[PDB]
Amino acid sequence: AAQTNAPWGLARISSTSPGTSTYYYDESAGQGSCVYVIDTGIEASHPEFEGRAQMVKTYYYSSRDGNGHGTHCAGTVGSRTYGVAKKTQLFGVKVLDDNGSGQYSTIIAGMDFVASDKNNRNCPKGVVASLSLGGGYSSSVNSAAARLQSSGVMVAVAAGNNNADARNYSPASEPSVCTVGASDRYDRRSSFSNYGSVLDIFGPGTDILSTWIGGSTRSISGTSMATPHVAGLAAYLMTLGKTTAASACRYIADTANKGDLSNIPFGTVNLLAYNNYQA
Ligand SMILES: [Ca+2]
Ligand SMILES: [Ca+2]
C-alpha cells in the first residue's frame, strides 16, 4: 500500500533516503496488535482513530485528554492519516495530568496496570507500550519499565529533550527497553534530542504532524514524537510475524538505516527506524 503526500516522518521510515513523500507499507497495517499509549489520555472520538481507540484507565478525575500530547502520540502510532500502524488497536492510560505532569508513583502504577490488563485483551499479534515521558533518574521507574518489558510487552520510551546523555533520565536509562532518540527531515539529530550509549534507535521527531484534541491536528517536536513512530513500527512488524515483543527493539536496530544521520556524538548509535518494505 502507498500513502501519497504523507507526513515526512512516515515517508522517512519507509525509505532508505530522506526527502521522499510517500509512505509505503503492507496492507496488514498492524491489525491484531495492541498499543498502550501511557500519557495524558486519548481523544478516542477523533475521526482519525475510526473507533479503534479507547481509554482503559485514568489516575485523575477524568479520562479525557485535556492537554493534547497523548492524542498526538496516539495519532502517530495508529491514526488513519498520521499513523504508522493504521489498523492497530489503541488503549489509553492517563498517568499525566492535563498540564502534562505526573508523579513517578502514578507513572509506575500505570506501567504495572498495563502488564496486568493485557491479559484481559484480545491482541493475538502482540502488545506494545509507548511512553513519551520521563524525568530525572529513578531506579524505581526504571524497574517498572523493566517489569513491563519482562511481562511480554514491547516497551518504547523517549530518550528525552535535554541535549544530554540519557543515562541521567528515566525510564530512558533502563537498558532492557527500547530508548528512542529524535531526528529531523534532513537526517540530523534533532537539536534537543538526548543521546548516549543507552539509545537503541532514532525516529522522526522534529515537526511531526498528528492528531490533536478538539478533532484537530497540529505539528510539534520532541523525542515524544519519535517514540510512537518506533512503537507503531513494532506493532506493524509483530503483525507481519517478523519479530516478537521480546526482540522487536533488537530487530528494529538490526534492520535500521545505518549511518544516515548527522550530528551523532561518538558512542551513540547511528540507526534510523526503517520498515524495509518491498512491493
Ligand atoms: Ca541511506
Ligand atoms: Ca535498550
Side-chain angles (χ1 to χ4, degrees), residues 149 154-158 172 174-180 198-201 227 230 248-250 252:
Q149 175 72 39
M154 190 282 182
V155 181
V157 312
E174 170 53 40
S176 67
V177 305
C178 206
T179 302
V180 181
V198 75
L199 264 71
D200 294 287
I201 193 70
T227 309
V230 169
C249 190
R250 173 176 279 193
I252 282 161

Short mmCIF file of all heavy atoms in Angstrom, two decimals, residues 149 154-158 172 174-180 198-201 227 230 248-250 252:
data_model
loop_
_atom_site.label_atom_id
_atom_site.label_comp_id
_atom_site.label_asym_id
_atom_site.label_seq_id
_atom_site.Cartn_x
_atom_site.Cartn_y
_atom_site.Cartn_z
N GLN A 149 8.40 -4.68 30.29
CA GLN A 149 9.07 -5.38 29.20
C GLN A 149 9.12 -6.90 29.47
O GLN A 149 8.80 -7.73 28.59
CB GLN A 149 10.48 -4.82 29.00
CG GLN A 149 11.29 -5.55 27.96
CD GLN A 149 10.82 -5.28 26.54
OE1 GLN A 149 10.45 -4.16 26.21
NE2 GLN A 149 10.81 -6.31 25.71
N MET A 154 6.29 -4.98 24.35
CA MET A 154 7.37 -4.22 23.75
C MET A 154 7.30 -2.79 24.26
O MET A 154 6.37 -2.06 23.94
CB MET A 154 7.27 -4.27 22.22
CG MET A 154 8.50 -3.72 21.50
SD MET A 154 8.59 -1.91 21.45
CE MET A 154 10.11 -1.69 20.50
N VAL A 155 8.28 -2.38 25.06
CA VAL A 155 8.26 -1.06 25.67
C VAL A 155 9.16 -0.10 24.91
O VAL A 155 10.37 -0.34 24.78
CB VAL A 155 8.69 -1.10 27.16
CG1 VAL A 155 8.62 0.30 27.77
CG2 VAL A 155 7.81 -2.07 27.95
N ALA A 156 8.57 0.98 24.41
CA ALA A 156 9.34 2.04 23.76
C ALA A 156 9.26 3.32 24.60
O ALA A 156 8.17 3.71 25.00
CB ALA A 156 8.82 2.29 22.34
N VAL A 157 10.39 3.95 24.89
CA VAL A 157 10.39 5.16 25.73
C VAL A 157 11.20 6.28 25.09
O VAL A 157 12.16 6.02 24.37
CB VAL A 157 10.94 4.87 27.14
CG1 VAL A 157 10.29 3.62 27.72
CG2 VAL A 157 12.46 4.68 27.11
N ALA A 158 10.80 7.53 25.35
CA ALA A 158 11.52 8.69 24.80
C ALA A 158 12.87 8.87 25.47
O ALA A 158 12.99 8.71 26.70
CB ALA A 158 10.69 9.96 24.96
N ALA A 172 14.20 6.41 30.36
CA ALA A 172 15.14 6.35 29.23
C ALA A 172 16.37 5.47 29.49
O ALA A 172 16.84 4.77 28.59
CB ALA A 172 15.62 7.76 28.85
N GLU A 174 16.83 2.88 31.37
CA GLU A 174 16.65 1.44 31.58
C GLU A 174 17.08 0.65 30.34
O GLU A 174 16.47 0.76 29.28
CB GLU A 174 15.19 1.13 31.93
CG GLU A 174 14.86 -0.37 31.92
CD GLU A 174 15.80 -1.20 32.78
OE1 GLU A 174 16.18 -0.75 33.89
OE2 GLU A 174 16.16 -2.32 32.34
N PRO A 175 18.16 -0.15 30.46
CA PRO A 175 18.72 -0.77 29.25
C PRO A 175 17.77 -1.75 28.55
O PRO A 175 17.86 -1.90 27.33
CB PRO A 175 19.96 -1.51 29.78
CG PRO A 175 20.27 -0.86 31.08
CD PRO A 175 18.96 -0.44 31.66
N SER A 176 16.88 -2.41 29.29
CA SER A 176 16.12 -3.51 28.71
C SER A 176 14.95 -3.06 27.83
O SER A 176 14.34 -3.90 27.17
CB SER A 176 15.59 -4.44 29.81
OG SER A 176 14.62 -3.81 30.63
N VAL A 177 14.63 -1.77 27.84
CA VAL A 177 13.54 -1.29 26.98
C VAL A 177 14.14 -0.66 25.72
O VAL A 177 15.35 -0.76 25.49
CB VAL A 177 12.62 -0.28 27.72
CG1 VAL A 177 12.09 -0.89 29.01
CG2 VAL A 177 13.34 1.05 28.02
N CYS A 178 13.29 -0.06 24.90
CA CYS A 178 13.74 0.50 23.63
C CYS A 178 13.71 2.01 23.73
O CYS A 178 12.65 2.63 23.71
CB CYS A 178 12.85 0.01 22.47
SG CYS A 178 13.66 -0.01 20.86
N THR A 179 14.89 2.61 23.85
CA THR A 179 15.04 4.03 24.09
C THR A 179 15.25 4.77 22.77
O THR A 179 16.16 4.46 22.01
CB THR A 179 16.21 4.29 25.04
OG1 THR A 179 15.96 3.59 26.27
CG2 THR A 179 16.35 5.79 25.32
N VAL A 180 14.40 5.77 22.52
CA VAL A 180 14.26 6.36 21.19
C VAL A 180 14.70 7.83 21.12
O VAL A 180 14.13 8.67 21.81
CB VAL A 180 12.80 6.25 20.73
CG1 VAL A 180 12.61 6.84 19.33
CG2 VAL A 180 12.36 4.80 20.79
N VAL A 198 22.98 4.42 25.84
CA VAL A 198 21.74 3.71 26.16
C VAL A 198 20.69 3.83 25.05
O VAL A 198 19.72 3.06 25.01
CB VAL A 198 21.17 4.19 27.51
CG1 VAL A 198 20.51 5.56 27.39
CG2 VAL A 198 20.20 3.15 28.08
N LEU A 199 20.87 4.77 24.12
CA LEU A 199 19.93 4.87 23.00
C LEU A 199 20.00 3.63 22.11
O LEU A 199 21.08 3.10 21.85
CB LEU A 199 20.20 6.11 22.14
CG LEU A 199 19.33 7.32 22.50
CD1 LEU A 199 19.73 7.90 23.84
CD2 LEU A 199 19.38 8.38 21.40
N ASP A 200 18.83 3.18 21.65
CA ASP A 200 18.73 1.98 20.81
C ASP A 200 18.52 2.32 19.35
O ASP A 200 18.93 1.57 18.45
CB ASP A 200 17.58 1.08 21.27
CG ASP A 200 17.83 0.49 22.64
OD1 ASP A 200 18.67 -0.42 22.74
OD2 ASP A 200 17.17 0.95 23.61
N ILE A 201 17.86 3.45 19.12
CA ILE A 201 17.29 3.74 17.80
C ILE A 201 16.85 5.20 17.72
O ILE A 201 16.52 5.82 18.75
CB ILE A 201 16.09 2.78 17.50
CG1 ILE A 201 15.68 2.84 16.03
CG2 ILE A 201 14.89 3.07 18.44
CD1 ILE A 201 16.71 2.19 15.10
N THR A 227 9.12 8.47 19.61
CA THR A 227 8.82 7.21 20.30
C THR A 227 7.62 6.44 19.68
O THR A 227 7.74 5.23 19.42
CB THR A 227 8.58 7.47 21.80
OG1 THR A 227 9.68 8.25 22.32
CG2 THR A 227 8.44 6.16 22.59
N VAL A 230 8.37 4.44 16.57
CA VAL A 230 9.00 3.15 16.83
C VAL A 230 8.00 2.16 17.42
O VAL A 230 8.00 0.97 17.06
CB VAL A 230 10.24 3.32 17.75
CG1 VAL A 230 10.75 1.97 18.25
CG2 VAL A 230 11.35 4.06 17.00
N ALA A 248 11.80 -7.17 19.46
CA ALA A 248 11.47 -6.18 18.45
C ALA A 248 12.47 -5.02 18.39
O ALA A 248 12.83 -4.57 17.31
CB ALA A 248 10.05 -5.64 18.68
N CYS A 249 12.93 -4.55 19.55
CA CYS A 249 13.87 -3.44 19.57
C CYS A 249 15.16 -3.84 18.84
O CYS A 249 15.67 -3.10 18.00
CB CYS A 249 14.16 -3.00 21.00
SG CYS A 249 15.08 -1.44 21.13
N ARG A 250 15.66 -5.02 19.17
CA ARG A 250 16.85 -5.57 18.53
C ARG A 250 16.65 -5.73 17.02
O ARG A 250 17.52 -5.36 16.24
CB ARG A 250 17.21 -6.92 19.18
CG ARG A 250 18.32 -7.68 18.49
CD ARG A 250 18.67 -8.95 19.26
NE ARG A 250 19.56 -8.66 20.39
CZ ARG A 250 20.22 -9.58 21.08
NH1 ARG A 250 20.11 -10.86 20.77
NH2 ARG A 250 21.00 -9.21 22.09
N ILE A 252 14.50 -4.12 15.12
CA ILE A 252 14.41 -2.79 14.52
C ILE A 252 15.81 -2.18 14.32
O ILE A 252 16.12 -1.62 13.26
CB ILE A 252 13.52 -1.87 15.37
CG1 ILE A 252 12.04 -2.20 15.09
CG2 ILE A 252 13.79 -0.40 15.06
CD1 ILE A 252 11.04 -1.72 16.15
#
